[PDB]
Amino acid sequence: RVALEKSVSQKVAAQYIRYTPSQQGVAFNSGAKQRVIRMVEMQKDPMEPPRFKINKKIPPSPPAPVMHSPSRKMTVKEQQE
């Protein structure tokens, strides 16, 4: 219920982080293996139109294995009936 509630309201409508480069290399930095950064959200202008042209027009799940039956072929009797 609440998930669909979210999605229905959706389709009707600075905080901090810690980063470990993994290329850290004590000579690369000033020497801190952890960086602290505040991410902030840039403001959008209300007076501005849709940005980029999404009119464009175009790799699904793995193919299910056919737990099928074996086919047993066609007599000439049936192939004429």
Partner: protein, 222 residues
């Protein structure tokens, strides 16, 4: 400036929006031009709404330049509001307006009848514009959301593009027979030609459908 940006972004250099908000072709247009340069009721409604506000603003610009008068400014505003019909031309893109047009005419008759009773004669100078002004402010209370949605649509078609992927058009009155057959023959294909198969390679469905078509012609001809 907004209406010009739109025109010239559409590249219609053979059209010209003048300063009283009339859109005029500058030469004669070939066919491909006449087609690419048609505008819709959203553009024309925004035009004529802006045309009415310009007429009101310029009545005031004259009074402020010293040209007319307080009494003639009032009488002229009352003229504008009783005669929005033949000053602008909004009704061609929303004929429902003639209801506001008839309202403002009725109020004109009421007010003139009560105004010109005694010594005062049937000349121009009656300006009591609160009435017709009210009427067009309610008109705009309503039309403002309509035009916001319509103009959002037009701009978003201008800036993203025209989406034809998932149109989902309805079945209306002209597509009724074609749709009946589209569906009859989809159903025929499903039904027999893959639930009674052992036409194993191809079930010659394109020939069973020819038999269906000939059966219908034979029914019709008896």
């Amino acid at each position: 400036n907004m209406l010009n940006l739109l025109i010239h972004r559409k590249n219609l250099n053979y059209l010209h929006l003048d300063y009283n908000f009339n859109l005029k072709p500058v030469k004669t247009l070939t066919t491909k031009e006449r087609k690419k340069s048609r505008f819709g009721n959203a553009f024309h409604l925004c035009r004529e709404v802006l045309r009415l506000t310009k007429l009101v603003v310029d009545s005031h610009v004259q009074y402020r330049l010293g040209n007319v008068d307080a009494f003639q400014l009032a009488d002229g505003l009352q003229y504008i509001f009783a005669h929005v019909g033949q000053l602008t031309g909004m009704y061609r893109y929303k004929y429902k307006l003639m209801r506001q047009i008839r309202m403002c005419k009725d109020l004109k008759h009421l007010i003139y009848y009560r105004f010109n009773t005694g010594p005062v004669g049937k000349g121009p100078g009656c300006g009591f514009w609160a009435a017709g002004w009210r009427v067009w402010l309610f008109f705009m209370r309503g039309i403002t959301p309509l035009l916001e949605r319509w103009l959002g649509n037009l701009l978003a078609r201008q800036f993203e593009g025209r989406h034809s992927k998932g149109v989902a058009k309805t079945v209306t009155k002209q597509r009724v027979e074609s749709h009946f057959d589209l569906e009859l023959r989809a159903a025929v294909m499903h039904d027999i030609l893959d639930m009674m198969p052992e036409g194993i390679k191809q079930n010659k469905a394109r020939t069973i459908l020819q038999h269906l078509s000939e059966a219908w012609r034979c029914w019709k001809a008896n």
